[PDB]
Assembly symmetry: C2
Homo-oligomer: 271 residues x 2
């Protein structure tokens, strides 16, 4: 039917072997496939990444290109530099919101986390019209606080909120509920693009992405083939095919060119 | 916690290359793994199957062995013959319950279907203490009628009801609801073992098996690796690992020896 699901591919990021011309090649196949957003890299991470993100940003003419940044002004500056020639640039910023991460990793309190999010999302918003924000480790976050962190990013200018199952152990019941909670508590929900980024540790990343869509998500992030990370990401091909075959149930359309999926798939496998 | 999930493996059936000694070898690895029921074959289908089912029935001493039969007295006779030396034999009988199958395949009305089910389940029950029944194509069956066919099998002596997503296009929402409906409409539900047999056409077989367990199923049928059929079956390893890792959520135990999963897996892949 009428609701539109966007696709966000992070294949070029979770190459964790791809050389430069190979990244460019993949990127152009992704674009051909009708992927809406290509995450090209994490520019601050190394000079190589920086040049690679620039390279893909220059090659792409028909979709959006994005790069990763922490809540650190330098990363955002570097991403803005990397993406300056993108036809439709975005930036993807993240910060963990779970108790364990805040205590042991960030060494920051809830108040500090919300304050970092507000500052860095606003900071980025001055440079990018489209700011995606991900509360890292969302699925193990205190739920009230997860809602706080997400409201904070929205207030500050984030127009895409991506919910990752960073650990990979959620299920459709638990994840769908997470989205229900966001819908109920975030007044701006219907004006904001919500995405998921599921991991396949338990073999449920596809079901999890679709449960998020049944519950409000209008975007799915993942990879060609579901490669990456420990136990893999959401296989975008599986999600697109489920939406197509059960259009009666999901009532959604996408921009994907279905017949370009095996090209995309064989290319990625080949490398 | 306290509820027990049984595992039903059909690897030796959806070898659709395995030779005789290889089937016996797999069967004994399955048994080692702690699988509760091994479906050894479909005895009526060929004399080879018959001898293979006999062979596995003789080798197995610590779990149950089962074979397939249609609702045809000859199949059941042949299965009874095949399994006569099983330490804990069962039989698995099936009949389609969807409008399309009844019209185009069976060429039988609803009344005829229920009457076949009653007759052949009772027939089998005289020979086997444990009769499993599967309404083939359950997930595309009229729901009221699916409930009729399942009630009929129970009344007639079936103590295990297996719900297959024969076509492979269901999802956790739709499947969980199917189980909710059975629970609400079948007075004997809590006295009857309910299982699922999901297919992985959409990449959701694992999530689907777990959704059936959240909703009353106390048994899961599938294969080592999820091999078989068109697009594969439920990967029993994924289901067992999800139950273990999220015991907090699923609150279930199994009889599986988790550390025997890679042996089982490498054996099956090797062949």
């Amino acid at each position: 039917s009428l609701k539109k699901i966007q696709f966000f591919d992070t294949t070029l990021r979770d190459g964790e072997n791809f050389d430069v011309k190979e990244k460019i090649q993949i990127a152009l196949q992704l674009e051909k496939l009708g992927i809406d957003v290509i995450e090209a890299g994490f520019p601050i991470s190394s000079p190589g990444d920086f040049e690679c993100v620039k390279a893909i940003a220059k090659a792409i003419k028909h979709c959006s290109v994005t790069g990763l940044a922490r809540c650190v002004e330098g990363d955002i500056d570097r991403a803005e530099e990397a993406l300056k020639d993108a036809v439709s640039p975005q930036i993807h910023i993240f910060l963990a919101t779970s108790d364990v991460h805040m205590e042991y990793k960030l060494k920051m309190s809830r108040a500090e986390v919300l304050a970092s999010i507000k500052h860095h999302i606003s900071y980025a918003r001055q440079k990018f019209d489209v700011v995606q924000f991900s509360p890292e480790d969302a699925t193990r976050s205190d739920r009230a606080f997860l809602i706080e962190a997400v409201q904070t990013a929205i207030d500050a200018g984030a127009t895409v909120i991506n919910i990752p199952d960073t650990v990979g152990y959620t299920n459709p019941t638990e994840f769908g509920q997470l989205f229900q909670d966001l819908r109920r508590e975030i007044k701006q929900f219907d004006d904001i693009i919500f995405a998921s980024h599921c991991h396949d540790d338990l073999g449920m990343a596809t079901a999890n992405a679709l449960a998020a869509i049944e519950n409000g998500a209008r975007r799915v992030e993942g990879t060609i083939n579901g490669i990456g990370e420990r136990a893999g990401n959401t296989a975008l091909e599986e999600v697109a095919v489920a939406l197509h075959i059960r259009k009666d149930f999901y009532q959604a359309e996408t921009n994907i060119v279905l017949n370009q999926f095996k090209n995309s798939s064989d290319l990625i496998s080949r490398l």
